[PDB]
Write an enzyme that holds these catalytic residues in place. Structure first.
Site, mmCIF file in Angstrom:
data_model
loop_
_atom_site.group_PDB
_atom_site.id
_atom_site.type_symbol
_atom_site.label_atom_id
_atom_site.label_comp_id
_atom_site.label_asym_id
_atom_site.label_seq_id
_atom_site.Cartn_x
_atom_site.Cartn_y
_atom_site.Cartn_z
ATOM 1 C CB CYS B 88 37.773 10.582 1.158
ATOM 2 S SG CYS B 88 38.220 9.437 -0.070
ATOM 3 C CG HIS B 90 38.678 8.309 -3.967
ATOM 4 N ND1 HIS B 90 39.518 8.914 -3.242
ATOM 5 C CD2 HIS B 90 38.756 7.120 -3.949
ATOM 6 C CE1 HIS B 90 39.968 7.815 -2.425
ATOM 7 N NE2 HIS B 90 39.515 6.758 -2.851
ATOM 8 C CB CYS B 236 44.521 13.094 -7.709
ATOM 9 S SG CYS B 236 44.748 13.459 -5.803
ATOM 10 N N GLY B 237 41.145 13.895 -6.949
ATOM 11 C CA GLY B 237 40.147 14.981 -6.557
ATOM 12 C C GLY B 237 40.626 16.289 -5.983
#
Ligand code: NA
Lengths: 312, 308
Positions: B88, B90, B236-237
């Site tokens: 994840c 972020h 949004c990475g």
């Protein structure tokens, strides 16, 4: 530790699923001889602080904030200013249950009856032996009965228009009220709200009907409801003011007697117990519910953060 | 009452709940094993922390763990209101930033152990964090999809750590006040793809939809539909990794060239890639800021103690 940041001590709770953020220390000092003037001070001079704790990312849409205040009245336990991500409120039943349960867990309020000053005047709240709180609601009444409204996409809907501290349109029994169906329920109740406004259907004296509630049967309560609140949100609780309006309709239809307890379940299965006594041609309802703690927190505001004071 | 110490932060608007002490001890010797133990034997704690009324639907949780590998700074297990995640980006930025603020991590390159392997994150001297994303690639280019009620939409199908449909174009205006219409449109697109069995490689469900438009300051602004009809507050990475992959394949962006991606709320990430096979290795740089230092409280008397 976090010495470059502003710190606000809050206690988060929920009342039958509907969350309250009680603010204890760190908020701007407010001036005024009454809670109403303090609320004006907050709005006029310190509104960024409402925004920092209620907007994303610290806040979320369903939350109500409650700022603890010294009492205004000689016989009040405390004062409180309620607010949300859009502005300032007057009275707030679920927030008051939250406030009282919170101060209970801190020892500042003990069982018995308490007066709480708000910008809109005093509120009587009883803290019970078992931790529940009963709040006496404002005078409630039905304005109109079984009013038809044609809702595009759904046909004609009948409902009562009633006042319980807010204006409600009450539709009582074939959507059925399950938590996994809130999208469809929100769309439906939203369509109703829009239709009322389009068609100029109001409460007494032009009052905008900004809450919509649906009622259905429930296996272990008198009723279960779904309640659309301003801003396309639904109430997780049975809604104190909405349930006050429901009792006014029940009373006006001869379906509930004074002193008799009505049990109202919410969309998520939490429950309120309610009863009324007659006051003139209307009713004085009391709503009993239970709040539990969620968090004891220090909110942190870092001025280096582009969203320090909330995302639009 | 059960007490759980959390540090809440957000990364470009997208919040992370870092859990620090108070949770039951997880069994296992690898972060993967501890994640299974969490899932199987302590899931109610995920739900207490993430579901209403304590959590909200945009939140990602991160449980701080002892590192398993000799060179890792720590371990982490990420989770959300539906289950457990692997990596994840972020949340890793928020983790690193939080540890920095607690005085537990200093600037430099760090390795963080997750149930899905190591993640390289650099904490820069200015407090930003660059996270290295998994290998990203485009699966198909300009796939047409007929969306009931909207017409014919084209987009790339690409992997960035999740499967994305990146929309070629549309006359939607990517502004925060329009998220309702954007959600309706992107949700319809998502349902359309699944109804017509339009998928990533290996039948992978395309559960994220990204729209792009021009920005006055950044190279692009997006709107990203995530699972649950939720939208990403950040750029949004993984969706930006997917976008780079498409840009790279189209020869619109070179290795090491920085791309700046604005989000629906005007927050920003910087991104760049190096080549790795017929795909790319992107890196995503962003910033996290603190929201709260909190003790979550779980009262066993509460019918919703462990979440609604
Ligand atoms: Na019943």
């Amino acid at each position: 530790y976090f010495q470059s940041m502003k710190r606000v001590h809050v206690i988060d709770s929920h009342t039958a699923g509907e969350p309250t953020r009680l603010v204890m220390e760190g908020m701007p000092a407010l001036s005024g001889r009454t809670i109403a003037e303090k609320c004006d001070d907050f709005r006029d001079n310190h509104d960024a602080w409402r925004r920092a704790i209620m907007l994303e990312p610290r806040g979320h849409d369903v939350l109500v904030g409650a700022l603890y205040c010294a009492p205004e009245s000689s016989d009040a336990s405390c004062g409180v200013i309620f607010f949300n991500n859009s502005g300032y409120l007057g009275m707030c039943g679920h927030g008051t249950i939250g406030l009282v349960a919170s101060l209970h867990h801190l020892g500042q309020l003990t069982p018995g009856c308490h007066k709480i000053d708000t910008p809109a005047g005093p509120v009587s709240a009883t803290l019970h032996d078992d931790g529940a709180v009963t709040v006496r609601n404002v005078l409630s009444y039905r304005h109109r009965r079984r009013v038809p409204v044609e809702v595009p996409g759904y046909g004609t809907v009948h409902g009562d228009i009633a006042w319980g501290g807010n204006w409600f349109f009450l539709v009582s029994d074939d959507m059925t009220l399950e938590l996994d169906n809130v999208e469809a329920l929100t769309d439906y109740t939203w369509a109703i709200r829009q239709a009322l406004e389009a068609q100029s259907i109001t409460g007494e004296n032009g009052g905008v009907i900004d809450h919509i509630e649906l009622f259905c049967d429930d296996r272990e309560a008198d009723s279960r409801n779904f309640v659309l609140c301003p801003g396309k949100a639904y109430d997780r609780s049975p809604c104190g003011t909405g349930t006050s309006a429901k009792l006014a309709c029940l009373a006006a239809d001869g379906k509930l007697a004074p002193g008799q307890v009505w049990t109202q379940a919410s969309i998520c299965g939490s429950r309120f117990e309610a009863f009324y006594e007659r006051e003139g041609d209307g009713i004085r309802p009391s709503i009993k519910g239970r709040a539990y703690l969620s968090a004891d927190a220090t909110l942190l505001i870092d001025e280096r953060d582009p969203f320090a004071w909330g995302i639009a």
